Each structure stands twice: as C-alpha cells, then as structure tokens.
C-alpha cells in the first residue's frame, strides 16, 4: 500500500497456458524444420 507504506496483498504469478502452448509449438516448429538444418542453427533457435 503506497499511502501507508505497508504490504497488503500478494500477487501469485503464473505462466499462462496459452503462452505455454505457444512455446511448445515454437519448439515443435524448430524440431520439424531440422532435416537439413545444422546443429548450430537448431541450438541457436532454441536459445533465442
């Protein structure tokens, strides 16, 4: 609480399931386009 300079609540954060699915689909897309892709490019896409 800004006015009283005291804590009053707690936000419990959590990653949305839609973003989970987006990341999983990104990894699936990276893995699928890897027949001719080099190891360095795959790992770079993973890291990014």
């Amino acid at each position: 609480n800004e006015v009283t300079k005291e804590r009053t609540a707690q936000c419990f954060l959590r990653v949305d399931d839609e973003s989970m699915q987006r990341f999983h689909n990104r990894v699936r897309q990276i893995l699928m386009a890897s027949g001719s892709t080099t190891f360095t490019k795959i790992v770079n896409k993973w890291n990014t």
């Binding site: 699936r28 893995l31 699928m32 890897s34 027949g35 001719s36």
Partner: protein
C-alpha cells in the same frame, strides 16, 4: 498410378533395364491396388515429366511378374529400385536396407533429389550413393 508404362513379363523388365544407357531406370515393384503402391505411384507420376531427361519410370506387378521376388527380396507392399546401365545402383537411405525404397514417399522433391543423386553417382561409376536425406527417423514432431 495407371498413367505410367507397365512391364508384363520378366523379359520386358530386363529389356527396359538394358535399353536405357543414359537414364536411370526407376522400376516400382508392387501392385497397382496396394494403397502404399498407390501413394508411391502418384508421387512417381507427379515427377515423371520432370525427370524424363535423366530418368525413366516403369511399374511392375510382382504377381504378374514374379521373376524377381526371390532375387530382389520383393516381399514388401511397395518397392522402388534404381538401375543404371544394367547395374543395380544401391542407395544409402539410412534405413538399413541399401538396395531399395520399400516405403511410400510424400514429397515430389524428395524423390527427385534421390533420383538425381542416383543418376550422378551412377554416371561417376559408383554402385552406392548416399541419400541427401536420412530415413532412420520419420522426423515427426
């Protein structure tokens, strides 16, 4: 699947293999009624015009023409084999069987690349060529 030329006896297959001196003789061993053979024959039909400069495609029924079943181990629903100047050109597909393509492909460019690699290797005088793509896995994700 039905638009491709057909060979109706073993002598015709031998002559087709012998006749072509400058092109790869791609012969599919199977049955026009087998779904795997239908897929493979559709793929071969889609590329038949494209590769006509360096490849000729024939279809052989292994029941009508059983003269190569024991020889070439044609005991699979579909089988594609490559011959160049009366020599069977093996290909290292990574599947453990380097003599034939015993499954059905889905990409025209894949089959065209394999045909081109076989053509180049056989022109250089090689009995085994390495496929540009490995097939130890189906790349399914």
């Amino acid at each position: 699947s039905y638009m491709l030329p057909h060979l109706h006896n073993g002598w015709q297959v031998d002559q087709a293999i012998l006749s072509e001196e400058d092109r790869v003789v791609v012969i599919r061993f199977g049955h026009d009624w087998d779904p795997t053979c239908m897929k493979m024959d559709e793929v071969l039909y889609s590329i038949a015009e494209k590769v006509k400069n360096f490849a000729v495609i024939y279809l052989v029924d292994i029941t009508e023409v059983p003269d190569f079943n024991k020889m070439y181990e044609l005991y699979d629903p579909c089988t594609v084999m490559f011959f160049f100047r009366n020599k069977h050109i093996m290909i290292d597909l990574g599947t453990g069987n380097n003599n034939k393509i015993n499954w059905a492909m889905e990409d025209k460019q894949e089959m065209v690349d394999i045909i081109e690699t076989v053509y180049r290797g056989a022109r250089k005088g090689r009995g085994l060529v390495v496929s540009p793509k490995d097939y130890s896995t189906k790349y399914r994700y």
